[PDB]
């Protein structure tokens, strides 16, 4: 009856009783980190809350109902969907233009939770026209607390890739990200770059739109930002770009991206080490001049070091970086690899339980021997000298057909 | 026009031509990591591939069509959905008992991709009865490559939490997980434990089902498995369980769980350090006996060391672990923290950008001073000697109202 009385009092003609009841509902949803959302929905309070959103004559009541609806929309998809089905979104879009700042901001917060539910709720709110008035809040005078909520909604607008947001929405969001990437607040900068990382993870056409925005020269130097939160997001965003074409990759390289990577391969955090090698693996998958840029940047010995001593996640990306180079590189670039003693630590990975890593190393060794027309003898002994030949022989006993067939063909052709 | 010809030939009365056409379609989907799924869907080949699944008179064609449909279902949700709307699932389910092993396995693979799309497709395949014949494949004679695909589908049956799988499905899966957790293959062990981690992240009632299965005494010792992939999955699974009630937490503790954590707190991997402290923070949020078990296991000095010298992700969990203890512990248990020199590294976190961490530390300091009846003076001196008092005073000017109000209350009450 406590919940039932609160619902009845939320429709009271007495304004003091009505405001107190909506507050009591809000506090049930905000007093702890396990709110009773389903109980309040079944009590019948949703249509009353959506209804208080129209009370322009009582801003205090509008604010409390928007707060209560914000927390209901923060729950499961079914609970977020109940707020949608109550037709609250058109009223939240109304309140973006409220003269009262706390009402306007809470409506942004509520819409962000609905947008964050998934692509279909995102596209419903987009269809009603949320993006333009949202970006209109970006101004010199906006409070910093409010702007952090605005950039959080922008992240939610970019974050679902199945499907990505419509192209028109991306073309509206990108000029706003170009403004925000120069902000000195760390949280806004982190959100801005994560938003870019979601847009660059959406395919090559979206990558080109990010490039055409002109934002890449202002993104690459963030690889050496003091804050590791910014570095991690920037490494992800530029890492996604270099998954595109050779030209798109060259744009990132022409912003001096490789200069930042000595400090990234030696960074304290293993996660940055792994993503940095993953980045480089996509450069050694490029053309021969991009392979040469990695060589000229003196990054190969640091890759081979992590291939040997790094954690298994990083060693895995390092094997890809080496194996990619054996497919794209010239003979003199692969010879540079042999001179840097890639053979022993490369072969040491042949005994791991990850069948993909074993296949990557076997593919690389096959390409190395096929490429060294005259020096295949020297390389063949180097492989046996470190115990690699013994490991190739036992991989003939492997469960995977692609692996044991390649082990057979390697020994027949070169041993 | 080659695509149109392949589609035409896929309906040929000439069995050689039909098999080659379906093969050519499969090849387009399997020859690289960027298959043209949309082109094949638009070509009209889906209902022809589905009809090939009915050809019990040609197992080779059945296998090739199942492989082709497997890869279409491995794409976007709309592409997985196009296979569903072609009514392929009932035919895949009847192919689970084909006399031909390769046809059977490929049907399991295709169904796993549909289940992996989301909860709605998962429940559709469950509604048609996939779980029982899937688990019937678990036997002493099953080839290990097939078993890894069965356990992967079992992971996909457990992986979505909005909503979780039906209770009836979980009760069917748990006895299979009890069998597989004794397997010696690492990949099957890792899949089995990750499936448990998904089930234990689904709420306290699913946690009780996992406990009632009797599998916890066989999960906890995997915290010290030789393979770090197993340790990581096991730490996640037992970590989810201790997010439940005090009784559910005590089940894990009575399996000697805390004896594994010295090696987890000093492990080379930072992520193991962080999630191990997260585990311990949920133990210090328990009753006073569980707080005492952490003290008796000699873990507090190791927590305080990581609070001082760990990466920031681990420092946050350590701040939670200390702050949780100040709420639940006795006075002699909090006094033990002071003797273990908690004050300096605890206060040193007051200057981080994470507003949640600052709130956590202020809450802990306030709780410490309130429970030190006479020793509030000694502790107040310790807080100022390390610079903590200076940091609390400047937090009175913080942009967060919860933070600066508590900063004032601490100074008003104790300084």
């Amino acid at each position: 009856t406590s919940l039932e009385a609160i619902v009845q009092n939320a429709s009271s003609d007495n304004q003091g009783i009505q405001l107190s009841a909506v507050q009591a509902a809000r506090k049930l949803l905000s007093s702890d980190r396990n709110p009773p959302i389903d109980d309040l929905i079944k009590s019948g309070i949703l249509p009353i809350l959506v209804h208080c959103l129209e009370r322009d004559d009582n801003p205090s009541l509008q604010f409390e109902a928007a707060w209560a609806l914000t927390n209901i929309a923060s729950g499961t998809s079914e609970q977020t969907q109940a707020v949608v089905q109550s037709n609250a979104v058109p009223l939240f879009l109304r309140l973006l233009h409220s003269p009262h700042q706390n009402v306007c901001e809470q409506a942004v917060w509520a819409l962000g939770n609905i947008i964050g539910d998934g692509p279909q709720c995102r596209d419903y709110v987009i269809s009603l026209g949320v993006v333009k008035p949202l970006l209109s809040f970006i101004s010199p005078s906006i409070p910093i607390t409010f702007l952090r909520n605005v950039t959080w909604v922008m992240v939610n607008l970019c974050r679902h890739k199945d499907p990505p947001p419509p192209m028109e929405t991306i073309q509206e969001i990108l000029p706003a990200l170009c403004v925000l990437i120069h902000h000195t607040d760390v949280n806004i900068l982190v959100d801005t770059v994560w938003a870019l990382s979601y847009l660059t993870d959406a395919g090559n056409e979206q990558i080109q739109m990010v490039i055409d925005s002109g934002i890449v020269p202002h993104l690459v130097p963030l690889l050496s930002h003091q804050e590791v939160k910014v570095q991690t997001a920037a490494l992800r965003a530029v890492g996604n770009i270099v998954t595109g074409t050779d030209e798109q990759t060259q744009v990132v390289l022409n912003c001096d991206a490789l200069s930042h990577f000595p400090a990234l391969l030696t960074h304290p955090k293993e996660k940055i080490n792994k993503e940095a090698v993953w980045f480089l693996s996509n450069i050694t998958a490029g053309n021969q001049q991009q392979v040469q840029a990695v060589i000229d940047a003196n990054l190969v010995p640091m890759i081979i070091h992590l291939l040997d001593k790094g954690d298994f996640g990083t060693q895995k990306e390092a094997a890809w970086a080496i194996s990619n180079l054996t497919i794209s590189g010239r003979k003199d670039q692969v010879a540079y690899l042999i001179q840097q003693n890639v053979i022993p630590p490369f072969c040491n990975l042949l005994t791991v339980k990850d069948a993909q890593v074993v296949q990557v190393v076997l593919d690389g060794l096959s390409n190395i021997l096929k490429m060294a027309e005259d020096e295949a003898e020297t390389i063949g002994n180097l492989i046996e000298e470190c115990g690699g030949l013994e490991k190739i022989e036992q991989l003939q006993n492997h469960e995977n057909e692609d692996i044991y067939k390649l082990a057979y063909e390697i020994i027949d052709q070169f041993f | 026009t080659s695509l149109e010809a392949i589609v035409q030939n896929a309906s040929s009365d000439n069995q050689g031509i039909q098999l080659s056409a379906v093969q050519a379609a499969r090849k387009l989907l399997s020859s690289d990591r960027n298959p043209p799924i949309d082109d094949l869907i638009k070509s009209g080949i889906l209902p022809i591939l589905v009809h090939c699944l009915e050809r019990d008179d040609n197992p080779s064609l059945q296998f090739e069509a199942a492989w082709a449909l497997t890869n279409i279902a491995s794409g976007t949700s709309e592409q997985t959905q196009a296979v569903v709307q072609s009514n392929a699932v009932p035919l895949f389910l009847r192919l689970l008992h084909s006399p031909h092993q390769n046809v059977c396995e490929q049907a399991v693979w295709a169904l796993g991709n549909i289940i992996g799309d989301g909860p709605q497709c998962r429940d559709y395949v469950i509604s048609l009865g996939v779980v029982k014949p899937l688990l019937s494949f678990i036997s002493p004679s099953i080839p290990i490559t097939f078993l890894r695909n069965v356990t992967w589908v079992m992971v996909n049956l457990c992986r979505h939490k909005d909503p979780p799988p039906p209770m009836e499905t979980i009760q069917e899966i748990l006895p299979a997980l009890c069998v597989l957790i004794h397997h010696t293959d690492v990949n099957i062990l890792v899949d089995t434990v990750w499936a448990l981690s998904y089930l234990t992240d689904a709420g306290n009632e699913q946690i009780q089902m996992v406990i009632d299965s009797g599998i916890v005494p066989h999960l906890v010792p995997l915290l010290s498995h030789q393979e770090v992939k197993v340790q990581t999955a096991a730490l996640r699974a037992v970590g989810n369980i201790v997010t439940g009630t005090d009784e559910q937490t005590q089940v894990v503790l009575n399996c000697d769980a805390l004896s594994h954590f010295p090696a987890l707190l000093t492990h080379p991997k930072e992520k193991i350090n962080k999630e191990a402290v997260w585990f311990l923070s949920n133990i210090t949020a328990g009753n006073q006996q569980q707080v005492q078990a952490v003290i008796d296991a000699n873990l507090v000095p190791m927590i305080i060391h990581l609070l001082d010298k760990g990466d920031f992700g681990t420092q946050k969990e350590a701040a939670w672990a200390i702050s949780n203890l100040t709420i639940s512990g006795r006075k002699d248990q909090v006094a033990y923290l002071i003797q273990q020199n908690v004050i300096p590294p605890f206060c040193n976190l007051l200057t981080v950008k994470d507003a949640q961490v600052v709130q956590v530390v202020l809450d802990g300091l306030s709780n410490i001073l309130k429970m030190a009846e006479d020793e509030a003076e000694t502790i107040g001196n310790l807080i100022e000697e390390c610079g903590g008092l200076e940091k609390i005073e400047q937090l009175q000017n913080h942009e967060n109202e919860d933070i600066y109000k508590l900063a004032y209350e601490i100074i008003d009450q104790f300084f």
Binding site: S30, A73, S74, G116, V155 | -
Partner: peptide, 21 residues
Amino acid sequence: GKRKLITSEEERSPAKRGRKS
């Protein structure tokens, strides 16, 4: 006092947020 584990993606970019009191 119990806290569920938040993934790395939800750590730096939480999809949904309730406003706490």
